[PDB]
Each structure stands twice: as C-alpha cells, then as structure tokens.
Subunit: 151 residues, 12 copies
C-alpha cells in the first residue's frame, strides 16, 4: 500500500500548511465581511485539523510514519506560503482559500484513486468524505464571490 | 360552518407551499456578497414558513376541512408566481423577491385575521395574528438590509 | 460533460423527492384509523429525512455546475411519482402501503443514481445515493413489518 | 364588574380538577392494544390540563377572587360526571371518554372566552383561547385514531 | 386496612387529598416568604404525585383496583380539607403542611409494617423510600419554623 | 392613522427604560431580610422588562415610527419619576415601589391594548396583552409577599 | 506421585447461596437478552413500530441487571459464568429458532413468560440473600423484581389481561 | 482611601449606561448591507457592557459607595454625548460611532486601572483590566470590518 | 456464498466477541484496570452497534438472522474459554486484539463478497466497521508497545 | 428508642470526615505511574464520601440528634488515624491506604445496618445499605487494580 | 525565594478547612425563618471554599511545598475557632458568624496578595485576588441581608 | 526581545512549534499509558492553540504583524524538533513534554516582565494566566514521572 501511504502522508503535509494559511487569513483579514469570515476560518481550521489527525492516524495504523515536524511539512507540501499582509482584500483572501481548497480536493481525488487501485477501501472513504465537504465549501465560497463553483 | 376561515386557511396552505419553493430557490441560486449570512437565513425562513403551513393545514383539518395536498393544487390555487432558477440574479434582487413574497403573506394573514374575527373563530384568528407579527418583523429586517424603511 | 448524467439523476431525485415529500405530508394530514398516534409523527420523521436528501442532492448538483429544479411546475412535470387528491377514507394500512410504494421507487432511483455516478467517476455523488438508499431500505423493512409482510426488496 | 369572568375561571378550576381525575383513571384502568401508546399519552394530557388549572386558578386570584381548592368543591361544582374505575372498558371507549371530556372543556373555554370578552378582560380571554386551541387539536388527533372526523 | 393492597389504596386516597391541601397552600399563601414557599409547594406536589402514581400502579400490578374518583379519595382519606383562607399566616400554612406530612409519614410506616409482615418486599421499599423523603422535609419545614423535627 | 398605536409604543419605550432603571436601583440599594431572594428576582424582572422594551420599540420601527433612543428622551417622555438611591429604604418599601411601577405599566399596557384595538393594529394589541398578563401576575405575587390582595 | 484429577458430573445448579443465585441470574439474563433480541428482529404485524423499539429498552434494562449482578458476584469472591456455553447450559429458559410468522400478541406473551420467570428467580435470590444476611445482594434482587413486575402489568394490559402475578 | 477608585467606578457606571443607550440606538436605527450581522452583534455588546456595569456598580457598593442609579445621574455624569436616532446614517458610520464609544471606554478603563493600582485596590484593578482587554479586542474587529488598523 | 451469509456469520461472531469482551471486563486484574475496565464497555457498545445493524441489513435483504446462543456459539469461528482472574492485563488486551484482528478479517471478506454482488449498502456497512476496529488495533497494540501489524 | 442508630450515624459523620481528609491527602501527595488516572479519581471518591456524610448527618438531625460538627470532634471520635503527607509513598501504597479506609467504612456501615435493623429504623437502614453497596464495589475495583481479589 | 508565599498558601489550606467545617455546622444547625434559602446557600459557599482550598494547596505543591493534610494540622494552624453546634442560635446570628469567617478569609487573602506581590509570585498573587474579590462580594450580600453596610 | 509585541510574536512561533511536538507525541506514542496520554495530548494541544490565538490577536490589536507561515515559526522558535520515533518510551515522551512546558513557562515569565515593564496590563494578564496553567501541568506530568515539579 506504498501509494496509499504516500498520499496520506502528502495529505498530512498539505493540511498542516493549509491550516497555517487559513490561520493567516483569520488574522490578517480586513474589509467588509470580516465579522462573518473571521469565525468561518475557525470552522474551516477545525475541519482541516480533523482530516489531518484522521489521515495521519490511518497512516500510523497502516504501519507508516507521518511527517510530524514543521520542516517536514514545509518541504513536502505543494502549497506555497506568503508573508501575512493586511492590504489583501476580503475577496482576495477568500479567493486564496478557494485556491487552497481546490488543491485539497485535487489531492483527495488522487488519494481516492490510489486507494481504490490498491483495494484500501477504508482510506478510500476517508478521502471521499473529505473531498465531499471541501467541494461544498468551494461552491459556497465561490458563491460569495459571485461565481460558479467551476470544479 | 366557518366557511371563509376554512377557505383562507386553505389559501394559506397553497401560498405557503409556493413561498417555501421560492425561498428554497433563493437558497440554492444565491450568488454575491452576503451569501454566507443569507444562505442559512433562507433555512430559518423555510422552517418558520413550514411551521405555519403545518399548523394552518391542521387547523383546517380540525375545523372539518380538507387541505390542499398535491403540488398541482398548490400551484393552481396560489397567488404567487414562480420563475425558473437564475444564478445571475443579485443578492439585493433575491432579497427583494423575498420581501415581495412576505408582503403577500402578511396581507394574506391580515385577510385570514379579519375573516376569522368576523366568523368568531378566535383560535384561527390567533394563528394568523402570530404568523403576521413574525413576517412583518422579517420585512423590517430585510428592508433594513436593503437600506430601506419597512413600508408596511 | 463527463458528469452530464450524474447531474441528470441528481435533478431527477430533486423532482421526485419534492413530490415524495408532498405525498408523505398528505399521509400525515389525511390519516385516520388505529395507529394514527404512532404514524402521524413518524411521517414528520420521514419528511425530515426526505428533505435532508433533497437539499444535499440539489446542492451537490449546484456544486457540479448544474441548475436544480426549483419550481413546483418543474417538480411535478419531471417526477415519475403520481399524486392523488387527499381522502380521509383511505385506511391506515393503505396509507402505509402508499409510503412503501414511494420508498420502493426512491430506492430504485438511488440505485440508478449510484450506478450512473459510479460510471462517471463521481464518487461523492455515489456515496450520497448510497447512504440514502440504505436508510430508505431500512424503512421499507419496518413499514412492511408493520403491515405483516417481508421487505420484498 | 368581573364577576362573570371570575365565575367561569372557577368553573374551569373545578372542571379541570375533575378532568385530571378522569384522565388519571384512563391512565390506570386502560387495557387492550394501544395501551403502550395511550398510557403515557395520558400523562402528557394530565400535565397540560394541570398547566391550565394552575394558570386559570392564579388568574382568578390575580383578579381578587377565591378559587375552589378542596375535592368536594371540585366535584360538586364541576359539570363533569365521574364513574368508578373499570378494566373492561375498551381502548376505543376510553379514548371516546377523553374526547367527551375534551369537547366539554373546549365548550367551557369558548364560554370563558365569550364572558371575558364581554367584561373586557383581555388577559383571561387569551388564557381561554390558547387552551381551546390545544384541546381542539387533541380532539382532532383522538378522533383520528378512532377513524372519525373531529366533529367540532 | 387488612393488607398491602388496602394500605396502598389508602395512600392513593390520602396522597390525592394531600396534593389538594398543598395546592390550596400554593394559591392562598400570603406573607413574607411567599416567593420561596409558593414554588416550593410545586416541588412537594410533584413528589406527592410521584408516590401517588407509583403506589397506585403497584396496586394495579398486585391485582387491585385503585380509587380513581374525587368522591373515593375524599371519603376514604383520613385528611380533612377546609375552605381556602388568605388570612392564614405563612407560618400557619407551613405548620399545616407539616401536619399533612406527619400523617403521611405515619401512613407510610403502616404501609412498611403491613408489607413487611406479608413479605411484599417491592411494596415495602416503595413505602420506605417515600417515608425517608417526607421525614427529611418535616425536618426542613420544622427548621424554617424554628423547631426540632419532633418525629 | 396608526398614530396613536405608534404613540403608545413610544411611551412604553420611555417608561420601560425608566422602569428598568428603577428596578436596577432596587437590586443595588436593597437591604433587609429577603435580600437574597429579591436581589436576583430584580434581575429576572429586568430581563422581562428589557424584552418588552426591545419588542415594542422594534414593533414601532416596523410600523414606520422612530423610537426614543437616548436617556434624555426616556427621562423627559416617561411618566415615571426617579429618586436618588438610598440604602435606608426597607425591603417592604422597595417591593411596594416595584408594585407601583408595575401597576403603572399594567395601566399603560391597557391603554396600548385599547388604542391598538381601535386602530386595528392586532399585532401591537397582542404585544400589549401578553405583557399586561405577566405584569399582573407579578403584582399578585409581590402583593402576596407584602401580605395583601393584588387589588388590580 | 501427583494428586489425582477428579472426574465427575460437576452438577451444581442448587440455588443454595446468594452467590449461586447471582450466577444463575447471570445465565438467565443472558438468555433473556437473546430472546428479547429475537423478538426485536423477527417481529411483524400492527404494533411493530411501538414494540420493536421497546425491546431495545427492555434489553438495556436486562443488561444493566446482568452487569450489576455479575459484578456483585465478583465482589463477593465468585466467578461469573462468562461464555455462551455456560449461559445456555445453566439457564432454565429455553430458546427456539426465529420465526417471522408469530403474531404480536404471541410475541408479547413470550416476553411476559420470560419476565414471569425472572421475577420468580429474583424472588428466590431475595429470599436466599435475606436468610444469609446479604443485604446488598437482597436490594439488587428487590430493585430488579420491582421493575420486571411493572413491565408485566403493562405487557399484560396491552394483551387485555390483568397482571396475574 | 479608595477615594478615586470609587470615583472612577461610578464614572464607569454612568458611561456604561450611556454606552448601552448608544448601542441600543445603533441596533434599532441601523440600515444598509451588513444589517443582518451587525444588528444581533449589538445585542452581544450590550450584554457585555451590562455585565461590566453591574460588576463595577456592585464593587462600588461593596466598597461602601453609592452608585449612580437614575437616568438623570447617568446622563449628567457621563462624558459620552447622545444624539437623536437617524435611520439614514450608513452602516459604516454606525460602526465608526461604536468604535468611538469603545475607544472612550478603553481609555476610561485605563484611568480606572491606573487609579486603582496606586490606591492599592487590586480587585477593582482586575475588573478594569478584564473589561479593557475585551473592549480592545472589539476595537480591532470593528476596525477590521471597516478596513482599518486598530490604531489604539 | 453471498452477502447474506457473511452478514449472518458476523451476527454469530459479533455475539461471541461481545461475550469475550464482557469476560475481560469482569475478570480483569492488574495495573490499568481503572482505564481498561470501562473501555471494554465502549468496545461492547460498538460491537453491539454492528451486530444490530448487520442483523437488520440481513432481515432487510430477506434473510433470517441467527438469534439463539446455540446458533451463535456453533457458527462462530471464535473460541471462548473459561473466565480466569490470573490472566494479566497485557494478556487480556492481547486477547482483545486477536478478536479484533479476526473481526477486521471477516469485515474484509464481507466487503469483498458484497463488492462482487454489487450490494453497496452492505459493502458500506462492512467498510465503516472495519475502519473503526482497525483503529482500535492500532491503539491497543500501542498500549502493548507494539506496531499495529495489520 | 433509636439511640444506637443515632450513635452509629454520628460515628459515620466523624469517620467520613476523617476519610475525606485521607482521600484528599492521597489526591495531593500521589507521585508515580497512574497519577493521571488516580488523582481525579480521588475527587470522585471524595464527592461520594461527602454525599454520605451530609445524608447521614441530616438523618441524625431528622431523628433529633446533634451531629459532630467540629474538627476536634471528628478527630477524637473517628477510629481512623491520620499521618503526615509524604510524597515518597508509592502509588500502590496510596491505593492500599484507600482500600483500608473503605474496608473500615464498609464494616461501619454494616454495624449501622445491623443496629438500625434491630431498632426498626428502616430509613437509616436503607442509607447504610446503599452506602455499603457502593463502597464494596470500589473495594473490588481498587483490589483489581492492585492485582488482588476483593477479599471482603 | 517563595517561602512566605508558600507559608501563606498553607495557612489558607488550614483556615479554609476550618472555614468549611464552620459552614457545614451552620448548614446543619440552622433554625428559623430563612432556613430554606440559607441552608442550600451554605452548600454554594462550601463548594466555593473547597475550590480555593484545592487550588491553593495544589499551587503550594506546584511550588515544591507540602500542604497540611490532616485534621490535626488544620486545627492547630488555623486562626479560626470552632465551637459545638447549637440549634438554639438564631438565623441572624448564624449569618453573622459566616460574615466573621468571611472577613477573616478576606484579610488572609489580602495578606496572601501582599506577600506574593512582594516575592514576585504573580500566579499565586492572582489566585488570592480572585478569591478575595468573591468573598468580599459575599460579605456585601450577607451584610445586606442583615440590614447592614458591608463595612470592609 | 525588546517589547511586548516582540515577546507576543516569539510566543506565536514557540506555541506553533510546541503544538507540532505535542502532536508528534500523540501519534508516535507506544507503551503502557498510551490510552491515558494519547487523548491528554489533545487537551494540551487545544490549550496551546488557545494561547496561540489569544496572543497573536493581542499582537494584531496592538498594531503588530504576527508570524503566520511555517517558515517564520520554525526559524523564530527556540524549540527544536526531531523526526518521529516509535521507539521513544512513554516516560521519555512525557519528559519531552515537560521540557517544552518548562520553556513555555519561562517565555511567559519573560512576557509577563516585559509587558509589566511597558505598562501593558492586558498582555501581562494573558501571560500570567497561561503560565499558571502550564505550571500546574508541569506538576502533574512530573508527578506521573515520580518526580517533584522542580520549577
Ligand atoms: Ca363568512
Ligand atoms: Ca376509515
Ligand atoms: Ca377488554
Ligand atoms: Ca442609507
Ligand atoms: Cl449603508
Ligand atoms: Cl516515588
Ligand atoms: Zn493555527
Ligand atoms: Zn488523534
Ligand atoms: Zn424545499
Ligand atoms: Zn403536523
Ligand atoms: Zn410539507
Ligand atoms: Zn441547503
Ligand atoms: Zn392524578
Ligand atoms: Zn402555581
Ligand atoms: Zn393541584
Ligand atoms: Zn403512571
Ligand atoms: Zn440596568
Ligand atoms: Zn432587538
Ligand atoms: Zn442482543
Ligand atoms: Zn461493568
Ligand atoms: Zn437597551
Ligand atoms: Zn447584580
Ligand atoms: Zn454482555
Ligand atoms: Zn434494532
Ligand atoms: Zn478536602
Ligand atoms: Zn445538606
Ligand atoms: Zn463538610
Ligand atoms: Zn485537586
Ligand atoms: Zn497538530
Ligand atoms: Zn481567532
């Protein structure tokens, strides 16, 4: 199950980075819509952390060894972090979250595919449930930004 | 016989069923700034609409009537017109649609209040009164969001 | 697109779930006979569940870039379920049979939903149909048991 | 000035006390299919009845009155008749008895509604209206179990 | 009171009248302490109603036929009711509740003895549980009244 | 028009604000046996009063009115008079003051009820009726604590 | 040499002491649970929607007694039966294969039969515990006997009968 | 001794009373996009303000003081100025006015902290500190909504 | 041969697994009792959860679940032994892991059989149960200082 | 008449007071593997003990007695002995100390049961029985954690 | 380094233990009007005292100290004096006794605050400030019940 | 670190790294006591995350710009991470936790002093509350390890 394991570990790195980005958005947001979106980041972070612990623990259960240091997360993740900046608009912050979410849904499709190929049906459901929710969020986020989900 | 109390309860069943459909369409097709507050707010409105619908229908049953209970009956008896879902409608326009729907229901509930008062059906009268109070409060709030007075 | 039929079955479900709700509510209202006190509130539970599937399936369709049916005309014209005027003289067991018939239809609709979404690689939609089908079938067993019959799925 | 309102509230106190007693008798003496549903349903009914009793008695106190407050006063002033407990009454018959008590109560509440309106006691008028709404809903549901229209 | 069923029915009657007396106190009470003791009667009434239902249903379980009319309760009960009087003092009202509770405690002891003698151990426990609570209440009401429980 | 309803709603906003102030003084300056029960009771009464205040004000807004919304407006339009806090007042005197305030409120709510009934503003009418009912129940209880009949 | 190993029919099943009745109850409660669960699954007919969930409530109550009586045996120094083999062999209740074609009336009459048996067993446990002076175990049997008897009344009432204890 | 800790506590009582009044005005008179989020948000702030008011007042009582307890006393002693309510004002102006009242309270709570530190009144010191911490958090968030730095 | 057969097998095996977990709950002695005694309650509630769900899926599918102790004991692959207080905590946990290993294996078989037969509902039931039991093996093994070794 | 029952109730008050003290010592002085489970567990034990203490003392009051109510009285009448706290005692020694306390309490509650039974004090009898049941369950569990039989 | 902060924490342990014992005596021996409010109120006070007790003792453990943990140590180190329970004491004298205990604890907590402030133990300092704040508020309330100023 | 803003940001870095370390322990833990200490790491992480958010938001409130990327956390933190190892014993993992907590308490002491020096009472209290809780944990962890707190 080398590929299932590998994608689970890739997920651990990327979710760790995704959390960090969402927290930056939580903190640096400024503009109309702050009062609704600030707490919404909290909800997203909670959901992301849930996936991260569950995917990492599935890897452990499969006899893997999850990335568990900031260096490992940073060097393995495909997500790039930029310095926090208050001058970003609310709408650009939300577009950043959509971008991160689009990537996560892409990674979870990969994890679904790989685990399906290897017969790891339990890991397959983990990725399917995560992808379901993340795609729902992409619809809602895109809707707030006056756009179709464009999955 | 409470003929008109019964007639107006059934009108309300039809119109509430269509009102719910319109709110659920707004819920789904909404796009633009404010989606995150207004999307779940439609859920709140739909629950309330739904509560009135079941109470009014069951008051009509209680009074010996026969509530409308098919979509055909709802469509053909409602005064509310439905249009196809369109994502290009703005938030402010979507909210305006909801206000128009609520103004109608508020007027309908007024008519039900008046009719039940005259027939001496005080229980029905109270059902309409409570529904109207809440709906008019929603109108104030929606209109305030839209930068406007309630204009009741 | 590659999900054209996934979308088609999601929309079908929206229309049929809307009509199925209408029917359950009719049963809630027009019910008369021994067992009213149990089954009357049970219809509320079914409607609640049905409404949950309705919102979720329509919203998945939106998420896939579709346009859900959202008028009573569209529900009525697209649904394969047929409505009749409410009648207090239908027996409790006839009303329960009617609900069973509706649930059999939805289980089959969800089966096709599963198969179509499965073939298009839309696994999220696949799971939505799968969860709904499971509960609907459990309901069929219970309703049939009340009626003194096997599930006969 | 509020002598009639006061008298009808005290009538309600007596009648509700006796209605409570009849419902508790049904609760205990019930036998036949449906017991498991209707036994606890009688507790729901008794709680509701007890709520009206305390509200109506305390409204009378509030208006400067003196509520009946002994079993003899309840029994002698109530229009409802009690009968000895009997396990051989059928479920259908027991539910029919509750319907009878509830119809009487719905009619008492209409009277109380009427009298309180005539004397300009709008608080008492509301108390009777709310209670009537709920009792009448119960008659619908009970009659339905019995395969009948509410026949209000 | 020949047996356990006889005492159970006696308690059904007395608990019904006890309830009525407590309800009278709830309504007719005036004086300093009203705000505490008004709601407290509700608590006592709920407890009394609990024993009432438990004891009656025990009698049914044993093959009896509980009293179930106001006439039966009033005639079989050893408690006496008087017309409501607002001019009774709050301390007199509490003293009246104590009187009722002392009677009930004594009835429950008689129920305990009879059921013990007959070997009706379920009924025995019912009376013992009820006696315990009533006696604790007598202590507390007596204390409010500046008196020893005097059981 | 609905001018008198709008006027009595606004009077209530002023008078509720001053009543709140008076109850908070009582909560704070209270001394004597009974403090431990009446001190928190004042919180409860304040929560109820603030509930009516917000509801009546927002009803006024909904009707196209403009509620009083400054302490100057409350003080100047209210019929209730305030005095400096004084720890030397007895519990009896504090509770009697609450009763007087409550009596005033019950009377204003009866005026609101009459005016709204005249103008056909049924929603406003019920708001006043609900409030009057609760306030009158409180006057019974306070008066009972003080060893007296409600004497409404 | 070594000590000879006894070969005997290890008969027991003489409800002599509290420990013995506690273990018997352990056995009977396990089988009662099994019967209740069969009624739960195989039930058909008008009343299913009320009685299907009700069996769950009864099962939970029975398991509560099972655990508490078993743990009381442990506390007193005993060794509770803890195998389906031990339960089936020591229990005086009889199990039959599941059958969908039993009326609700027949189902509830079966439950009554098991409950009557349990109440009688708990009465035995009560009497034994009392002669021994085991007042804690005595209480356990009394509490369980009380509620089982209440259920008998109710089930019998659904069936249009007196409790007939 | 406690002389100016008592003084600043009473100042806070007046200012919090007025701040409460302003927040309630904003709640009622707000119109424009953001209404549906900011309207209930004002209730949150009012509950919080009210908490400080009661705690600070009761600390003053505890210290042997006599808190201000009439609208006249609040109005005359508060440094905050009230204006007549106006629906036309924009949401962003409304939020800016709240920020203005909060900045004042934070500066008042600092003076409270300062004077209670020197005088040795450690309990009053912590009350002001906790309140200041939360008001400063609100300034950040309100300013953030308004597209600005906190600028404390 | 089918989903119905694996479902019934699970009914039998879950019944016996419950009994084993209850024996551990009762006979457990040694350091850790205070945490592992109640944990067995958690495991039993979970097991009983699957038991009822799988049994009722069987009924829904037109089957007839095993419903006597004799049917459970005979059809089950798990072997019960007599309760003994002298087993250590670490040995009792080792026993639970073996039972859970067996269950995870059965659930894989159920997953496979239902996948072939195109019975996605039953497939999902087995997939959900397997996920949880495997997670428990990880934790139990970790308490026993070992890898999951699935 | 109930002198023995009163006597044992009061003995229990003293002993439960000292037992609480010993348990709290264990809570504070525990060091070693198992701390994180056993530390909060002593809180569970203390709350249970405190419950018996208050119930038995109040039963004594109810019966006309005068419960020990000072540390001097508790210490002088308790048969349980206290030693100075020592972090150097092992977890397993601490648990053994808890077991010995509970064995004593179990024995005392049996003496209570026996005395109250002889005297016909069934309420006091039931209090000791219920307490003994729970303590004995704890002895089993504590012994199981120490790898031993309950050995009552 | 922190020997004086440790000493005062440990003094608190003894004093809080004796304070608990006094409150429990009051809880049990109380007779007179007000019993039904004050009896349970003693439970709330005991719960609060026990909170400080465990918190202060555990802070002492955390700082490397060894808390008093025996009735002998509590008794011998506490500055509070206990007397035998007396039913013949009035409610008002019982409450006055509680006030004395509380004035003592508030002085103790003031010492604790000052000592810990001098030694730069900011955590222990906050523990004392919080405890003092609450005990002082209770002194106000108890004194108000007794018709007096707090007189801190 | 010269001012309150500087130490608040130091804490943001260090709390982020401390989270990572606790999460490492949660995952790699093996040995008797796992079942207690595994969920305990969750409680610690929840608490750590609380300080992280409060301290960062206080920095924003004061007009600062908190670190908000893994790069900033890892480079600015004085805590060091190692690769996850299943072979570390329970007691060694708990000792790792203790040492992280000891550092954190020392940082919050420094934050207390710096903010007290600058008259920033609000920040002072934040550090004070955090240190109180961390010190209590050190005592309990040390107790589990058979040792004195040794602050
Ligand atoms: Ca007409
Ligand atoms: Ca019919
Ligand atoms: Ca019959
Ligand atoms: Ca404008
Ligand atoms: Cl605007
Ligand atoms: Cl050691
Ligand atoms: Zn974060
Ligand atoms: Zn985890
Ligand atoms: Zn809808
Ligand atoms: Zn309905
Ligand atoms: Zn509907
Ligand atoms: Zn939705
Ligand atoms: Zn009754
Ligand atoms: Zn009442
Ligand atoms: Zn009553
Ligand atoms: Zn009952
Ligand atoms: Zn106020
Ligand atoms: Zn409002
Ligand atoms: Zn089962
Ligand atoms: Zn157990
Ligand atoms: Zn306000
Ligand atoms: Zn207050
Ligand atoms: Zn079991
Ligand atoms: Zn089931
Ligand atoms: Zn203690
Ligand atoms: Zn007590
Ligand atoms: Zn105590
Ligand atoms: Zn502690
Ligand atoms: Zn983490
Ligand atoms: Zn935050």
């Amino acid at each position: 199950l080398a590929d299932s394991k590998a994608v689970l570990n890739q997920a651990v790195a990327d979710l760790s980075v995704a959390h960090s980005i969402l927290h930056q958005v939580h903190w640096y947001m400024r503009g109309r819509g702050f009062m609704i979106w600030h707490p919404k980041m909290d909800e997203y972070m909670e959901e992301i952390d849930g996936y991260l612990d569950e995917m990492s623990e599935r890897l452990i259960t499969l006899g893997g060894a999850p990335f568990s240091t900031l260096k490992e997360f940073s060097e393995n993740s495909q997500l790039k972090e930029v310095l926090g900046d208050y001058n970003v608009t609310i709408e650009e912050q939300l577009a950043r979250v959509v971008e991160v979410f689009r990537y996560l849904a892409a990674l979870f499709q990969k994890g679904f595919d790989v685990s399906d190929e290897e017969g790891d049906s339990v890991t397959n459901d983990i990725f399917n449930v995560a992808k379901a929710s993340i795609e729902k969020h992409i619809w809602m986020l895109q809707a707030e930004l006056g756009q179709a989900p464009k999955l």
